[PDB]
């Protein structure tokens, strides 16, 4: 018995393997587009890609991350609300069994059909696992889709995810630029949260771009093919691996923009 997305193991039972489930500054949470504060304090963000470089494709048995090299300064966020240098370790999304549901954060109640993570980490703590450790510790991206057109950067993903339909399974995947995910504007909402999935840590700086990307309905069907179970097991469809919102307690959310 173990956590997940199920009738029997989902969120609401997060709680009493991990009672961080319900502390004061967990993820992901409604953003209110009124109450949100413009801060013309916050800068642009920084976002380095250019030299990242992709190693592997693995289905963990609750999503599929992408993974990088970070024993570098390859790829790199920088600037809003962040203070030094995170390096970009994995990406990873979170969708829906139908197309009005799948996103965890939601703006003004709306849900979107997936949601996008690129997770980076704080190099002054040398390591992920310290960095989970820290309240400054992670910068997690955001990027909410909605479905219409097709994204041409998201099909290399769309097209390797029959190799690693099931958990446990993973798959070279060199040579992927994640550039090709990013909407045209960087403006963002950022609030201090925490990971959306056990351990649930308190560590995270989230930035959540107001612009969503759009993918075709075709490419996110690809993405509800895939099994929670390994091979051999009965097959359970990878769908609705997305958390409900969260209290926001004592935090405000901050806008770049007005
Ligand atoms: C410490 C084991 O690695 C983890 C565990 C949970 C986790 N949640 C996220 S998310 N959904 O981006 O907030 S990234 C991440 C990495
Ligand atoms: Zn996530």
Redesign the pocket.
Known sequence: HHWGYGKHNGPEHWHKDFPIAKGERQ??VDIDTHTAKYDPSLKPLSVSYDQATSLRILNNGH?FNVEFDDSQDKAVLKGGPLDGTYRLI?F?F?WGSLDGQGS?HTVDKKKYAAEL?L?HWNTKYGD??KA?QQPDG?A?L?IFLKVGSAKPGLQKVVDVLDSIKTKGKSADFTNFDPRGLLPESLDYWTYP?????????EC?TWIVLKEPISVSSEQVLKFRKLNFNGEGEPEELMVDNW?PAQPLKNRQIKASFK
Not at 193 to 201: C, F
């Open positions: 993820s992901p999503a994995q990873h979170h965890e993570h997770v992920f696992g989970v992670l997690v955001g949260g925490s990971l959306t999935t056990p351990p649930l840590l995270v958390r």
